Design a protein around this ligand. Structure first.
Ligand SMILES: C=CCN(CC=C)C(=O)Cn1ccccc1=O
Ligand SMILES: C=CCN(CC=C)C(=O)Cn1ccccc1=O
Lengths: 300, 237
């Protein structure tokens, strides 16, 4: 079990750690979160009470260092930092725990949501999408645009997701225009899976990360990326059977976890109706289809 | 974006552009089988690719053999159209290649865009106009060259005959669309109008009769009457 201490909480803020959220009042004696499961990436995120604009947060893995949060009154946000002095850190954390100034990450996984949402998400891959190599953790927020969005402006602060574009030379082999556009299997399997991602685990990892950034920060370009990566699989006639079964599980837990009140802005009607009802894989996503129909039948 | 009434004069500026109409690419007769089921028999078709400024119709004849052994022919027909149009652009010198291709039906947009990926600078555009190009097969000689073909074949010719010697491309296109709209609404009547006077002939290399300016005004008026007529015969007005 690991800990992310907080120097203090000078400004009123809703804090979230994965799918959990809680409120901290202005200058309430809060000194972080403890009992954080080792073995998964995590995201700690923030929404200031006084400006709900700019949700922002940090992806991290506690195995990669000792991390804490400290408010910066100049830049106006809660910042993640690494403490390199390990003795100093254990001491701080032990005192804060003794004083019970830390909220406890629940040891109540029954609804196995975080593992299922982050199964293929690796911190090393996150750090390639979010370039800031001096830090072991990765900052994301509502407004960051993707490489593909900037093609259609600050590159250092961009989400470097893998560019998918169904009407591109990469996607369409000369001489197979109609074949490759109506059945994207070449693009998925040879270009993307074999060529760029290397394996389906890395593909699913980016898909899951894009969804999580869309859900936790309302990052629109991440939502575009999540739907693109779904649509590329659903629009391929030839997909390994193990990828389809896993995709169905991935999407099930994403739909299960999405706030009911955010379905209007985070779910693209066209992609989902296509994928569940028109695509090659229309019959291969049983769990996802059943939850979608019972929870968001209006979308469909 | 799309082509409509408001930006009509762009058709006649000096940027090379083509209309592509695919409505006569895949053509069938529907008939009953001996068992009493229904079957289609394909007949030859054509892609109608028109420079509206110069009158150049790159008529690509689609022989029935191109459908042999193929499924979902109406969908393939749009991709075949796009393949042929792309091949036509590639065959033209750089300075003759269009800067825009306007498709008369929206379903052609994706097939053409995908076939034209090599030409990022050529704009593929839809239009809001209800253009009568489907009636091109009501032009006698044009129907005859398409129905006589025994193999794939391209015919380049001016669909406006020599009219541009005497009138602007705007006026020529308006005449063409009026003739084609008439032929589409009542072919027999429209053709009767065009030929009633045997002294006005069609040059061996022309589609339309050698009308004088004054006779074209009369002709053009008679085609409008027809279109209004039929519209009353249709709606009872
Ligand atoms: C301080 C409590 C925050 N907490 C754990 C986070 C560290 C949560 O479970 C968040 N949460 C979510 C649903 C219902 C109740 C609720 O508290
Ligand atoms: C005859 C009408 C238009 N057209 C084909 C007919 C459907 C042409 O070939 C026009 N044309 C051009 C150059 C030399 C000869 C010639 O006939």
């Amino acid at each position: 079990m690991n800990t992310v201490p907080f120097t203090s909480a000078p400004i009123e803020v809703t804090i979230g750690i994965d799918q959990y959220s809680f409120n901290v009042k202005e200058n309430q004696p809060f000194h972080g979160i403890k009992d954080i499961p080792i073995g998964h990436v995590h995201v700690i995120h923030f929404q200031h009470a006084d400006n709900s604009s700019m949700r922002y947060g940090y992806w991290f893995d506690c195995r990669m260092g000792n991390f804490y949060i400290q408010y910066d009154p100049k830049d106006g946000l809660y910042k993640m930092m690494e403490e390199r002095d390990g003795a100093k850190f254990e001491n701080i954390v032990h005192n804060f725990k003794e004083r019970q100034m830390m909220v406890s990450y629940p040891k109540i996984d029954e609804d196995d949501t975080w593992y299922n949402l982050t199964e293929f998400v690796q911190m090393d891959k996150i750090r390639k999408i979010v370039r800031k190599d001096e830090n072991q953790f990765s900052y994301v927020d509502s407004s960051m645009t993707t490489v593909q969005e900037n093609e259609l402006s600050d590159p250092a602060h961009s989400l470097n997701y893998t560019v998918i574009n169904f009407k591109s030379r990469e996607a369409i082999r000369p001489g197979h225009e109609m074949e490759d556009f109506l059945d994207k299997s070449y693009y998925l399997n040879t270009v993307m899976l074999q060529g760029i991602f290397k394996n389906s685990s890395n593909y699913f990892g980016e898909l899951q990360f894009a969804f999580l950034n869309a859900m936790f920060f309302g990052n629109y370009g991440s939502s575009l990326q999540w739907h693109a990566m779904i649509e590329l699989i659903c629009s391929s006639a030839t997909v390994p059977k193990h990828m389809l079964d896993k995709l169905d599980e991935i999407l099930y837990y994403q739909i299960k976890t999405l706030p009911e009140q955010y379905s209007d802005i985070l779910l693209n009607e066209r992609v989902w109706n296509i994928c569940l009802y028109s695509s090659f894989q229309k019959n291969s996503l049983h769990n996802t289809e059943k939850i979608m129909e019972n929870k968001y039948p209006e979308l469909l | 974006g799309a082509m409509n009434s408001s930006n009509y004069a762009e058709l006649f500026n000096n940027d090379i552009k083509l209309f592509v109409d695919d409505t006569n690419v895949y053509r069938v007769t529907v008939h009953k089988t001996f068992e009493g089921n229904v079957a289609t028999k394909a007949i030859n078709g054509c892609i109608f690719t028109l420079n509206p400024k110069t009158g150049h119709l790159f008529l690509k004849i689609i022989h029935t053999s191109v459908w042999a052994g193929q499924k979902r022919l109406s969908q393939l027909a749009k991709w075949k159209t796009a393949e042929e149009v792309s091949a036509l652009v590639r065959s033209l010198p750089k300075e003759e290649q269009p800067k825009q291709i306007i498709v008369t039906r929206k379903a052609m947009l994706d097939p053409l865009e995908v076939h034209m990926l090599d030409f990022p600078n050529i704009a593929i555009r839809p239009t809001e106009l209800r253009l009568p190009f489907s009636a091109a097969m009501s032009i006698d000689k044009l129907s005859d060259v398409v129905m006589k073909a025994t193999e794939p074949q391209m015919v380049l010719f001016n669909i406006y005959d020599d009219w541009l010697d005497r009138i602007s491309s705007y006026t020529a296109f308006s005449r063409l669309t009026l003739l084609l709209r008439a032929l589409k609404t009542n072919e027999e009547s429209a053709k009767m109008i065009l030929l009633s006077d045997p002294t006005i002939t069609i040059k061996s290399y022309h589609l339309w009769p050698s009308f004088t300016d004054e006779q074209w005004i009369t002709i053009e008026s008679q085609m409008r009457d027809l279109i209004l007529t039929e519209y009353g015969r249709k709606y009872n007005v």
